[PDB]
């Protein structure tokens, strides 16, 4: 009884391209066999990208939901729930992307005449994996703004998948908000030569964001201020730049204003799109969620350079994640994080990486703000060390034999279903992982039993002014973490 209240659900990401670029569900029989294995292993559900570039390929509002309806039907038949990602991004240029799925060609056609609809770096390179926040409210897509495109897409999904939603097949809607579906700037593009652990680059040089910034600095009484010109390039280290070096530009009035403006754009981008997601799924028995990327490199140095270029204005004396958690609260949304499997010792010393501390900060911030926090492993891992670290983060203070744990993640999604995962040894270890995540209890079909009942999505609470959101930048002590989990996959 008490142990079941400690149950943390486990989901598994489906293979990329399960539904191909031509909107065809290629191998249902193959997938079926895999899903049945997951079902027998105790997995609660699966996660899948519902690619915008596949669905609305033909043209504006020309949606084809047929292949995905077939996929959802199979998932339901196999007794698994689903986390559906509204993927308004391209698959192909990020780590692990083994299939190329661009955004709609008709959108790219518009991009040919207006290159500024894409995130742009100082050098002028255009990244076509996602539409810049700069055009969120620009009615340049055959009369629609980018946010309207996202809104219409989600509404169409809600209506065309109404039966699956009513039956409870979908656990949550992961609202894609940028590259790799994450609320972030494409500051570390492998497509432009970035290599870990480069500090990355600011991506606010498209004409819309640049004009936005210029107007902002003018209103601040400094019209002459320009975007950073001393931040170096993708593969630099912080000390080699005028912007991130000690006493550098990042701590000057100009630098602080820019960083605040830059990170604020993401806060409002997510807030505005979540407003549309709430409207689209209002009344549905599903929860909303967003994804925040885990930029752990340089976390251990004063400048947190990589986080800053990604859009997370997080420093040792400024919490850049709690404001995101606070923004999510009005939407009753889940903050889906990552790097749950990483240990600092596994990263190269020169990267000044702190994934363990970063995870502790983000999860603690979410709990401090009274919102649900879920997460994923950042990279493919099949070993016990990885699973034990995930289980530790899932319940930082262990299991409570007297009832529910004071601290527990809302769920964990494993990246990713593959042939390797299903191999004898790998899968046997994975089964132990599932068992421990479930607090040694057998798979529990009814989430209500472990206090995960889903009620109709209510309208979002009143808008929270930016000043109140930023009050959450006040540094706070993280919740204490055990050094190791009390539920290891082995002994």
Ligand X SMILES: OC[C@H]1O[C@H](O[C@H]2[C@H](O)[C@@H](O)[C@@H](O[C@H]3[C@H](O)[C@@H](O)[C@@H](O[C@H]4[C@H](O)[C@@H](O)[C@@H](O[C@H]5[C@H](O)[C@@H](O)[C@@H](O)O[C@@H]5CO)O[C@@H]4CO)O[C@@H]3CO)O[C@@H]2CO)[C@H](O)[C@@H](O)[C@@H]1O
E-assigned strand segments in 198-353: 287-291, 334-337
Interface residue with ligand X, options 196, 257, 427, 443 (CB under 6 A): 196
Q: Which residue's CB is nearer to ligand X, number 130 or number 141?
A: 130
Binding flag, residue 388, ligand X (CB under 6 A): no
Interface residue with ligand X, options 95, 218, 282, 468 (CB under 6 A): 95
Is 187 exposed, middle or buried (CB count within 10 Å of its CB: 0-12, 13-18, 19+)? buried
- Give per-residue burial for 139-154: e unless 16+ CB within 10 Å, then b: eebeebbbbebbbbbb
Binding flag, residue 24, ligand X (CB under 6 A): no
Neighbours of 95 (CB within 10 A): 11
Q: Rounded distance, CA 172 to CA 155, Å?
A: 15
Interface residue with ligand X, options 111, 198, 294, 447 (CB under 6 A): 294
Q: Rounded distance, CA 267 to CA 311, Å?
A: 9
Where in 125-164 is the site for ligand X (CB under 6 A)? none
To ligand X, the closest distance from the beta carbon of 35 in angstroms equals: 16
Binding flag, residue 87, ligand X (CB under 6 A): yes
Binding flag, residue 182, ligand X (CB under 6 A): yes
Where in 330-349 is the site for ligand X (CB under 6 A)? 338-339
Q: Rounded distance, CA 441 to CA 434, Å?
A: 10
Binding flag, residue 99, ligand X (CB under 6 A): no
| Angle ∠(100,158,111) on CA atoms, nearest 5 | 40
Binding flag, residue 376, ligand X (CB under 6 A): yes
To ligand X, the closest distance from the beta carbon of 378 in angstroms equals: 4
Number of residue whose CB is nearest ligand X: 338
Please, are residues 87 and 18 in contact by the beta-carbon 8 Å criterion?
A: no
Q: Which residue's CB is nearer to ligand X, number 291 or number 395?
A: 291
Binding flag, residue 181, ligand X (CB under 6 A): yes
Binding flag, residue 96, ligand X (CB under 6 A): yes
Interface residue with ligand X, options 7, 46, 49, 164 (CB under 6 A): 49
CA 416 to chain centre: 15
To ligand X, the closest distance from the beta carbon of 186 in angstroms equals: 9
To ligand X, the closest distance from the beta carbon of 344 in angstroms equals: 11
To ligand X, the closest distance from the beta carbon of 108 in angstroms equals: 17
Q: Which residue's CB is nearer to ligand X, number 95 or number 218?
A: 95
Q: Rounded distance, CA 71 to CA 31, Å?
A: 9
To ligand X, the closest distance from the beta carbon of 380 in angstroms equals: 8
Please, are residues 396 and 361 in contact by the beta-carbon 8 Å criterion?
A: no
Stretch that binds ligand X, among 1-9, 89-97, 142-150, 470-478 (CB under 6 A): 89-97
To ligand X, the closest distance from the beta carbon of 199 in angstroms equals: 13
Stretch that binds ligand X, among 60-68, 289-297, 312-320, 445-453 (CB under 6 A): 289-297
To ligand X, the closest distance from the beta carbon of 411 in angstroms equals: 13
Question: Cα-flanking dihedrals φ and ψ of residue 245, to 5°?
Answer: -70, 165
Q: Which residue's CB is nearer to ligand X, number 415 or number 487?
A: 415
Torsion of CA 246, 250, 252, 253, to 10 degrees: -160
Beta bridge partners of 315: 318
The β-bridge relationship of strands 126-131 and 118-120 is antiparallel
* 3-state SS record for 367-397: HHCCCCEEEECCCCCCCHHHHHHHHHHHCCC
To ligand X, the closest distance from the beta carbon of 31 in angstroms equals: 15
To ligand X, the closest distance from the beta carbon of 340 in angstroms equals: 10
Please, are residues 466 and 260 in contact by the beta-carbon 8 Å criterion?
A: no
Stretch that binds ligand X, among 198-206, 376-384, 394-402, 462-470 (CB under 6 A): 376-384
What is the number of residues in the chain? Answer: 491
Site size toward ligand X (CB under 6 A) is 22
Q: Rounded distance, CA 361 to CA 366, Å?
A: 9
Q: Rounded distance, CA 380 to CA 429, Å?
A: 14
To ligand X, the closest distance from the beta carbon of 242 in angstroms equals: 25
Which residues contact ligand X by CB under 6 A? Answer: 13, 49, 85, 87, 91, 94-97, 180-182, 196, 291, 293-294, 296, 338-339, 376, 378-379
């Amino acid at each position: 009884s008490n142990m079941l209240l400690n149950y943390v659900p486990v989901y598994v990401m489906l293979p990329l391209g399960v539904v191909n670029v031509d909107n065809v569900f290629e191998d249902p029989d193959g997938l079926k066999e895999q899903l049945l294995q997951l079902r027998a292993a105790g997995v609660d559900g699966v996660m899948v990208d519902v690619w915008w570039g596949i669905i609305e390929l033909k043209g504006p509002k020309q949606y084809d939901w047929r292949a995905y309806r077939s996929l959802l039907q199979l998932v339901q038949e196999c007794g698994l729930t689903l986390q559906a990602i509204m993927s308004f991004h391209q698959c192909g240029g990020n780590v692990g992307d083994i299939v190329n799925i661009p955004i709609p060609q008709w959108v790219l056609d518009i991009g040919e005449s207006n290159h500024d609809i894409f995130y742009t770096n100082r050098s002028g390179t255009r990244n076509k994996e996602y539409l810049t926040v700069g055009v969120d409210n620009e009615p340049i897509f055959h009369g629609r703004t980018a946010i309207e495109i996202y809104s219409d897409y989600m509404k169409s999904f809600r209506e065309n998948m109404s039966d699956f939603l009513e039956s409870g097949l979908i656990i949550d809607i992961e609202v894609g908000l940028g590259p790799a579906g994450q609320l972030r700037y494409p500051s570390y593009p492998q497509s432009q030569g970035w290599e870990f652990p480069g500090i990355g680059e600011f991506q606010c040089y498209d004409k819309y964001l640049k004009a936005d910034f210029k107007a902002a600095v003018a209103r601040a009484g400094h019209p002459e201020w320009e975007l950073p010109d001393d931040a170096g390039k993708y593969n630099d280290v912080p000390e080699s730049t005028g912007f991130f070096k000690s006493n550098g530009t990042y701590v000057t009035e100009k630098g602080k204003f820019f960083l605040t403006w830059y990170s604020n754009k993401l806060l409002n981008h997510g807030d505005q799109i979540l407003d549309e997601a709430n409207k689209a799924f209002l009344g549905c028995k599903v929860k909303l969620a967003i994804k925040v990327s885990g930029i752990h490199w340089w976390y251990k140095v004063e400048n947190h350079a990589a986080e800053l270029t990604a859009g997370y204005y997080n420093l040792n004396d400024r919490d850049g994640y709690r404001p995101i958690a606070r923004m999510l609260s009005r939407h009753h949304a889940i903050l889906n994080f990552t790097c749950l499997e990483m240990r600092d010792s596994e990263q190269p010393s020169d990267a000044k990486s702190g994934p363990q501390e970063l995870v502790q900060q983000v999860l603690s911030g979410g709990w401090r703000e009274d919102i649900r926090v879920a997460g994923e492993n950042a990279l493919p891992r099949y070993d016990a060390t990885a699973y034990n670290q995930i289980i530790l983060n899932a319940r930082p203070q262990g299991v409570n034999n007297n009832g529910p744990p004071k601290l527990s993640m809302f769920g964990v999604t494993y990246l990713r279903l593959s042939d390797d995962l299903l191999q004898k040894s790998n899968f046997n270890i994975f089964k132990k992982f599932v068992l421990k995540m479930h607090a040694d209890q057998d798979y529990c079909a009814n989430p209500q039993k472990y206090n995960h009942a889903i009620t109709p999505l209510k309208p979002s609470a009143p808008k929270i002014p930016i000043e109140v959101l930023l009050e959450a930048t006040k540094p706070t002590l993280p919740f204490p973490w055990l050094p190791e989990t009390d539920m290891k996959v082995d002994g």
